[PDB]
Design a protein around this ligand. Structure first.
Ligand SMILES: O=C(O)Cc1ccc(C[C@@H]2CCC[C@H]2CC(=O)O)cc1
Ligand SMILES: O=C(O)Cc1ccc(C[C@H]2CCC[C@@H]2CC(=O)O)cc1
Lengths: 226, 227
């Protein structure tokens, strides 16, 4: 096959989706074919559609999903509220494996943090990454507390031999500030910081977002992904 | 010795200090001698003093500090900003060991989350807990995101065989929305929820705080903490 990368985060609302779009965009601009799988989407009642975000920000067309829940909650809580089960582990893993092909960078977005239940029973994006032999890109914030959450997430990855492909700071403030500046240096000593997306990047149009994305990542690392 | 509990949290600003005071208050009301220690305190330049707040809220007089740093940041960054060094591992252990005595509950309040560096090189409250044979009480929020952070924290505890003394929800909203309610039920399936402090607990005066504290915990769990 090709390269499967799961795009996780230290938590919820840390920029997972915008990073997935940024990497997608930078990889497409490197001539890499990109697909994104988001097996479970919640929050559809209020308009949440992370696949469409990547579609519009990055131009990706291979956008694979299995389930959509109206409530802006955890997949398990959203599915409980809807009275309908989450998808099965086999559906997620097989969808990703069917998406994966030579020459292609396939990004996998879960929901919230790394140990969030995505499929029955208590299957997580970590289990899925083990099953498809994917490495994990970990999206982190620049804010107070990001170091503990990052170290916690990287331990959980290594505790299951899920390789860490690096960190991305989901939102980099202007101008940084003492905590943000200190955190960025401390994060680099924990793992490779592959990018720090400027704050506000999620609101960019497709051309501006592509420009930002190409500049945010190191071309050689992107091109080395596949 | 007695019982040493480290009081940690899923992150920063989740209620560790108020939980430390609430459990100290509850233990003191059951006649248990309580000492609270804060190995590393930052933010002294804006008046942060968790030992002083624990003393204010719970009446604890046996309060032991060690390292203090002005800036309200992580210990490593706050020490580097002040031109100072982090304490060594053995200094934190000595701080705690000197407090430990039979019949006494010694609470060790961390700074930030569990894997925060408290001593060079990369020594965390988890290591300290191994060193002094302490279990860890994990303070959590009820907010969206708490389940992942709680499971991450508990996994990190088990990875070094640090027993989890249970969870405490540091602020419980009244009434709870769907997410808060769903989270409390899910949290109780991953570990014992020892208490759920009512929102605004940090503002209660001494009497109300002591009453809140006595209600928040199961008297038999508190009284069983130390013989
Ligand atoms: O995890 C990191 O980013 C590193 C890290 C972030 C924050 C803290 C403690 C904060 C700092 C000032 C106030 C205190 C409140 C608290 O005790 O949580 C320690 C380490
Ligand atoms: O960990 C918990 O407490 C449970 C939990 C919490 C939040 C999510 C993600 C979703 C939920 C809605 C917006 C968010 C969008 C996103 O962050 O991708 C998943 C599991």
């Amino acid at each position: 096959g090709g390269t499967i990368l799961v795009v996780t985060g230290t938590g919820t609302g840390v920029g997972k989706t915008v990073v997935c779009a940024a990497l997608a965009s930078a990889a497409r601009q490197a001539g890499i074919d990109v697909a994104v799988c988001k097996p479970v989407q919640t929050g559809t009642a209020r308009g949440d559609d992370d696949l469409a975000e990547v579609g519009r920000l990055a131009g990706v067309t291979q956008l694979a999903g299995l389930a959509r829940y109206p409530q802006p909650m955890a997949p398990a809580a959203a599915a409980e509220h809807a009275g309908m089960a989450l998808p099965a582990r086999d559906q997620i893993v097989r969808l990703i494996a069917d998406l994966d092909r030579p020459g292609r960078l396939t990004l996998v977005e879960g929901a919230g943090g790394l140990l969030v239940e995505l499929a029955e029973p208590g299957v997580t994006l970590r289990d899925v990454a083990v099953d498809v032999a994917a490495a994990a890109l970990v999206v982190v914030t620049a804010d107070l507390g990001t170091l503990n959450h990052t170290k916690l997430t990287l331990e959980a990855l290594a505790a299951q031999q899920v390789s860490c492909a690096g960190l991305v700071i989901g939102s980099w403030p202007d101008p940084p500030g003492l905590v943000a500046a200190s955190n960025r240096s401390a994060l680099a000593r924990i793992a490779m910081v592959r990018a720090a997306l400027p704050a506000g990047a999620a609101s960019l149009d497709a051309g501006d977002f592509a420009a930002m994305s190409a500049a945010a990542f190191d071309r050689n690392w992107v091109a080395g992904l596949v």
